[PDB]
């Protein structure tokens, strides 16, 4: 109330209506979660193979708000509609609700545990498969971790309720995915080996990623015991004719069901999904309409009506989907400070191939410093840097490498020949040197070796799996250390999240000790505090509801503190808070 939410404008709290609750026509049916529950993952694969309709994976809970709302969508908004999604949309193959940037963002900016979100959503959604985006050797981090850390993360995530693991490598390197696929198989879950799509298979001028490359990668992934082949189009680069051709060639190559995931950045997501449906794709990633389009996934309702009278329908209850989309439309208004702005289809993504998260973060990093007025030159620098690196696959975290290299090159006014000739004197950004040192794995076609020698100077270059060169982690040692750092004995989920994000987890624990479970507040209250004379009710547990009313905000004293006159549970309570604006 007195200092504002960090990172956003300190605007007043708008009055908001309650979000519209769906009116659902419930139809009971056996979902894929049930088939995974009694029978195994192979019976789920058989269920997907024997389904003539195209199946849908809802990305509303993870990727739709990662793309549009900077991953800021809170558990409190998910909870009001999770049961409605589980019951009113039982035809969904899975719901993507975890992984990606959600793990970091929840802890860092939302001050809620991703594990707590997973537990609450799992309780609320018993008959819906839960899907996470697993980065293979990186898991949910950005660096690399030892093998037992990855296996323990998979074990804990599978135990806490993740059913489908979409496992991808940022450079499509199968060694950085084999162990994760095996661990997911061992834990009784579905492993989705993922091909990251880049380039243009129908463009002969770009033969590095052609149809044969994807076919060879596909049979290599089917050589592992992965249940479903995933095609990840992180930047929305897959054109509709290319989608039909690629999916047809993969269906000729492997026997695995194909799961296509694309973004609608160019405005061609629906037609690309339709072309893949003609080619025989099994599952496609869609978002709810109110969180679809732009950098997000194509709309689920739109893809129903796109395929309504064709040879293959979309397996969804579209009236229930529209009813749920009313709620999503209402709760999107809570996240106005995190909106990107006016959006439109942009086919320039076919040129620079920047994924939407990389687009937003590069825009933020370019406008935060004063050189953002040449963002077109920045995107051209991104394209030429990608070409200079040897046309690499640009997804998390290798998209960050290209972005930081381009940002450095126009920040300090470099050129391709500048780096290629006199690049031995500049201090290169640390993500670029870590990528060229082999910390992210081995690219397709190898590094630009002499250029690699320009980037790396007197640092060790490794050429194998970086997980082999990782310092061992002992879980009892880490658990005892964490029990020292935090005031209690941690769970396995706390230990594993402390391993990946040590300072982020400790900062989250400090914020938990200071402010408590802020995840229980509603989003306007979470972001804006309270107005004068406002009454809010915070349900802290079952049967306990705090009645909080702000009666008066005191003037700041000489020490910079304000006294806030609250009425907690009928009783007056005076809270002293330091106003950061007055500064003592």
């Amino acid at each position: 109330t007195v200092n504002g939410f960090p990172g956003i404008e300190n605007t007043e709290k708008r009055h908001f209506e309650e979000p519209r609750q769906p009116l659902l026509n419930l139809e009971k049916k056996k979902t894929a979660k049930n088939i995974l529950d009694e029978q195994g993952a192979d019976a789920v694969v058989d269920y997907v193979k024997n389904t003539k309709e195209v199946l849908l994976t809802d990305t509303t809970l993870r990727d739709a708000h990662q793309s549009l709302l900077a991953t800021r969508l809170r558990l409190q908004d998910m909870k009001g509609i999770a049961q409605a999604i589980d019951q009113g949309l039982p035809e969904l193959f899975s719901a993507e609700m975890w992984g990606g940037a959600t793990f970091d963002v929840a802890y860092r900016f939302l001050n809620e545990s991703p594990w707590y979100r997973l537990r609450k959503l799992r309780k609320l959604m018993p008959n819906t498969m839960f899907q996470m985006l697993f980065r293979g050797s990186n898991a949910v981090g950005y660096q690399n971790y030892p093998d037992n850390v990855i296996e323990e993360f998979i074990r804990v995530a599978a135990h806490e309720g993740i059913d489908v693991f979409r496992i991808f490598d940022s450079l499509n390197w199968l060694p950085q995915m084999e162990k994760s696929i095996q661990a997911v198989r061992d834990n009784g879950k579905i492993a989705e080996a993922t091909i990251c799509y880049t380039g243009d298979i129908l463009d002969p001028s770009r033969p590095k990623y052609n149809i044969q490359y994807y076919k060879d990668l596909a049979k290599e992934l089917e050589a592992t015991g992965a249940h479903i082949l995933a095609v990840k189009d992180m930047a929305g680069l897959l054109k509709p004719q290319a989608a039909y051709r690629l999916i047809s060639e993969l269906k000729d190559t492997v026997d695995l069901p194909i799961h296509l995931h694309t973004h609608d950045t160019s405005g061609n997501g629906i037609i690309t999904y339709s072309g893949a449906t003609q080619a025989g794709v099994d599952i496609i990633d869609v978002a709810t309409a109110s969180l679809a389009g732009g950098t997000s996934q194509p709309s689920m309702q739109s893809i129903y009506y796109a395929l309504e009278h064709g040879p293959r329908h979309a397996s969804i209850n579209v009236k229930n989907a529209e009813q749920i989309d009313h709620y999503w439309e209402d709760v999107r208004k809570y996240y106005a400070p995190f909106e990107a702005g006016i959006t439109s289809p942009q086919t320039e993504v076919y040129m620079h191939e920047m994924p939407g998260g990389q687009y937003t973060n590069l825009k933020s990093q370019a406008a935060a410093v004063g050189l953002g007025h040449r963002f077109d030159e920045i995107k051209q620098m991104y394209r030429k840097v990608n070409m200079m690196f040897g046309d690499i696959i640009k997804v998390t975290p290798s998209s960050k490498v290209v972005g930081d290299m381009a940002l450095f090159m126009i920040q300090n006014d470099l050129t391709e020949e500048d780096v290629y000739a006199r690049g031995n004197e500049l201090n290169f950004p640390e993500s670029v040197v870590s990528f060229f040192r082999g910390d992210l794995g081995q690219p397709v076609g190898g590094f630009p070796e002499k250029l690699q020698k320009i980037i790396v100077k007197d640092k060790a270059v490794i050429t194998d799996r970086p997980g082999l060169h990782a310092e061992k982690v002992d879980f009892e040692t880490v658990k005892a250390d964490l029990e020292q750092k935090i005031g209690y004995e941690p769970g396995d989920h706390e230990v594993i999240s402390y391993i990946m994000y040590p300072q982020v987890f400790l900062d989250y624990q400090k914020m938990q000790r200071e402010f408590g479970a802020v995840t229980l507040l509603d989003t306007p209250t979470f972001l804006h505090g309270m107005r004068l004379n406002e009454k809010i009710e915070v349900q802290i547990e079952k049967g306990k509801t705090l009645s909080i009313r702000l009666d008066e905000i005191g003037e700041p004293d000489l020490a910079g503190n304000r006294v806030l006159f609250f009425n907690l549970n009928g009783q007056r309570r005076e809270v002293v808070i330091n106003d950061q604006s007055v500064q003592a």
């Binding site: 049967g543 306990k544 509801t545 009928g570």
Partner: protein, 91 residues
């Protein structure tokens, strides 16, 4: 066999039964009307639930079906009526 008791009353008698239940080691469930939201007895129990939504507050405290519904969903083993509202009510 009793582990949780609901009080179908308000005011000081609800607090009295809550104190007796805490001394006897039982869990406490309060009920309250909307117009009684700032009552002390609501915040003296382990669980509190709104009853008689839309009714007059006296009629809300006489909502028999709502009181048994709250007691059943809260897992209360027993109901103490206190006095003055439904203590002498046969129904």
């Amino acid at each position: 066999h009793m582990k949780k008791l609901l009080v179908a009353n308000r005011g000081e008698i609800a607090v009295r039964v809550f104190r007796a239940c805490n001394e006897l080691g039982l869990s406490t469930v309060a009920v309250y009307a909307r117009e009684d939201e700032y009552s002390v007895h609501r915040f003296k129990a382990d669980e509190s639930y709104l009853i008689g939504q839309g009714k007059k507050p006296i009629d809300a405290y006489l909502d028999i079906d709502d009181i048994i519904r709250v007691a059943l969903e809260s897992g209360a083993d027993a109901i103490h009526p206190g006095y003055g509202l439904l203590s002498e009510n046969l129904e």
